[PDB]
């Protein structure tokens, strides 16, 4: 992974319990690495699941870090 | 898990204030005080003097 550039192409399905608490979170879709042509290529998957949750930790992680 | 799992957890600390004391002397129970002085001393000194 070292010195590579990663792109996370992510959709998140989310059932509810109340206005604020999700009764289920799903966050998936492919991780891609930039090649030396600037073409991207699928190397990985995101595969977060969950029951009761006050947020999507994946998109939080990538807002700060990415 | 939000701020109900990480908030009923972060404890309350108590910074001390300055109770300045007059530092009057410790009076010991009479039984301890008779041990210090000789028994003969009771009634012997005129305390007016």
UniProtKB/Swiss-Prot annotation, chain A:
Shown part of the complete sequence: 1459 to 1524 of 2051
Subunit structure of this chain's protein: [Alpha(6)beta(6)] hexamers of two multifunctional subunits (alpha and beta).
Protein name as annotated: Fatty acid synthase subunit beta
Gene label: FAS1
Highest taxon of the lineage: Eukaryota
Similarity-based family: Belongs to the fungal fatty acid synthetase subunit beta family.
Miscellaneous comment: Present with 91800 molecules/cell in log phase SD medium.
Task performed by this protein: Fatty acid synthetase catalyzes the formation of long-chain fatty acids from acetyl-CoA, malonyl-CoA and NADPH. The beta subunit contains domains for: [acyl-carrier-protein] acetyltransferase and malonyltransferase, S-acyl fatty acid synthase thioesterase, enoyl-[acyl-carrier-protein] reductase, and 3-hydroxypalmitoyl-[acyl-carrier-protein] dehydratase.
UniProtKB/Swiss-Prot annotation, chain B:
Post-translational events: 4'-phosphopantetheine is transferred from CoA to a specific serine of the Acyl carrier domain by the C-terminal PPT domain. This modification is essential for activity because fatty acids are bound in thioester linkage to the sulfhydryl of the prosthetic group.
Taxonomy, superkingdom: Eukaryota
Similarity comment text for this entry: Belongs to the thiolase-like superfamily. Fungal fatty acid synthetase subunit alpha family.
Subunit note: [Alpha(6)beta(6)] hexamers of two multifunctional subunits (alpha and beta).
Function of the protein: Fatty acid synthetase catalyzes the formation of long-chain fatty acids from acetyl-CoA, malonyl-CoA and NADPH. The alpha subunit contains domains for: acyl carrier protein, 3-oxoacyl-[acyl-carrier-protein] reductase, and 3-oxoacyl-[acyl-carrier-protein] synthase. This subunit coordinates the binding of the six beta subunits to the enzyme complex.
Record's miscellaneous remark: Present with 17000 molecules/cell in log phase SD medium.
Descriptive protein name: Fatty acid synthase subunit alpha
Residues of the full protein shown: 969 to 1017 of 1887
């Amino acid at each position: 992974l070292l010195n590579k550039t990663l792109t996370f192409e992510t959709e998140t399905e989310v059932t509810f319990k109340n206005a604020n608490i999700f009764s289920s979170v799903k966050c998936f879709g492919p991780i891609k690495v930039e090649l030396p042509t600037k073409e991207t290529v699928e190397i990985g998957i995101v595969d977060y699941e969950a029951g009761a949750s006050h947020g999507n930790p994946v998109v939080d992680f990538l807002k700060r870090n990415g | 898990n939000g701020n109900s799992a990480d908030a009923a957890y972060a404890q309350v600390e108590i910074q001390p204030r300055a109770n300045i004391q007059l530092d009057f002397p410790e009076l010991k129970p009479y039984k301890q005080v008779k041990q210090i002085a000789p028994a003969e001393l009771e009634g012997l000194l005129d305390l007016e003097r």
